[PDB]
Structure 1
């Protein structure tokens, strides 16, 4: 068991501390196998690894600024949510004072800490990540995004956008399947059983199209934007017939229509990245 300090005992902070304790680490906490101290100065002095999980980065700076001298030679893992610039500014300050800095984001809620298949994403000091990965595994599956401390904040936002696109298309499909009409009156649970299997194919599409974006070359092969637009129009008609009004078909047909007007009808879906950036 390694020595680890947690700063912040809100619902998430308290969950982080409990996961470290459960893995057998010598856990000091500040806001019963944990050692609770009254001051953050005492908490920071107790451990070479300081895991921070406060409400805001403004709170981070209020807590950590008076401890600049006390942070020399320590490793700071900052799981507070906030902006990319705030992660970067905190990283630069930590470097100034000789603390190894790793910024991270928690891709679950407190009840998911310590459970399988939940991600915590980190960016910043590679030496901090490699040295602390074994202890950080107590919280969930750690991923090292790279060396730029601000990356984790951007990844969280982008990944939530992906989640909301998926879940909104799921809701649209649930409503289409549940509606009255031939082939309808299907439960959400039955639809989702098939959807679960289908997502493996959707994952093939995302892994096929990422190289297209990075190359700036978008070969349509057997599923061109012409075919997307045609079948999107079917989706729109079907949704109107069955009373599903989500705005997704209107968004899809407008976006693909602009690429087709521009002459890229034979390209893959990846071409559409040029029409949102």
Structure 2
């Protein structure tokens, strides 16, 4: 399959190599076995699928706006990182000039491209995703978020916050396990061996609590917010004894405490969405 990569930076060059490794006829172009052309006009003309990874959405428009007429009948997969509004604006512009627009985000570094274990998230034209999915598989596992092009930007930000939340609880537990004391002086590798098994149950919690959020009904069942707050105060006590100062226990008891004061102690953790949202 013919595919054009616009932008051969660290990530861009990784994407072009993934297409070549997967047996695609690849044309490349950079602002600074692949067939490199000297102009973006030539690159766009060489393929019906044009993948874009530029530094900013401003760079995307500076390169693509002069090519407004050349893009009719083509598919534009824009993996550039940017805001939800810029993804929507580029989607509308592409729709104006007759191009199928898929906005995407790469959920790994340049060295993760080509490996099918890393995710790339796309949102926008469904005909583009379905028609291009086999080619996009060269870069990693493709997921279709839906029809709104701006979804990929929001998802990346929301998934990074989930990652940092996980990693901050992990680092807190690592220091907790490493501190001197009875049952302490455990290495981070030993703790993480158990932690990664435990993450299967944490994933079950998230799967259990998402319908709670959507329904506005948060049955506490066997793990009420009373018990969360109860055990969070033990974590804060243990952390103060073992010298672990991460700010997490203060965030958690204050959040649950506000929900308890509101009278929702008999609810599940998902009720706490009402206390971080507007």
CA shift at 1:117, angstroms? 1.3
Q: Is the 8 A contact 2:229 2:253 kept in 1?
A: yes
Deviations 1:44-86 (A, max 9, x none): 0000000000000000000000000000000000000000000
Whether 1:167 and 2:167 are equivalent positions in the alignment is: yes
Contact 2:177 2:188 in 1 (8 A): yes
Range that drifts further, 78-87 or 32-41: 32-41
Whole-angstrom distance in 2 between the partners of 1:101 and 1:196: 38
- Counterpart residue number, 1:22: 21
> How far apart are residue 96 of structure 1 and its match?
0.2
Q: What is the Cα deviation at residue 116 of structure 1?
A: 2.6
Residue 273 of structure 1 and its aligned partner are, at CA, apart by 0.1
230-239 or 29-38: which moved more? 29-38
SS at structure 2 position matched to 1:24: coil
Unpaired stretches in structure 2, ≥5 consecutive residues: none
Q: 1:209 Cα shift?
A: 0.1
Q: Please give the per-residue CA displacement for 1:115-146, whole angstroms capped at 9, x wherever unaligned.
A: 13100000000000000000000000000000
- How far has the Cα of 1:242 moved from its partner? 0.2
| Superposition TM-score, scaled by structure 2 size | 0.99
Range moving further from structure 2, 57-66 or 25-34: 25-34
- Report Cα offsets for 1:203-248 as digits up to 9, x if no partner: 1100000000000000000000000000000000000000000000
Please provide the CA RMSD for this pair: 1.2
Runs ≥4 residues deviating over 3 A: none
Maintained 8 Å contact 2:53/2:79? yes
| Structure 1: gaps (5+ residues) | none
Residue 59 (structure 1) aligned with residue 59 (structure 2)? yes
Q: What is the alpha-carbon distance in structure 2 between the residues aligned to residue 117 and residue 100 of structure 1?
A: 27
CA distance in structure 2 between the partners assigned to 1:206 and 1:178 by the alignment: 28
Query: Does the CA contact (< 8 Å) of 2:73 and 2:100 recur in 1?
Result: yes
Q: Normalising by structure 1, report the TM-score.
A: 0.99
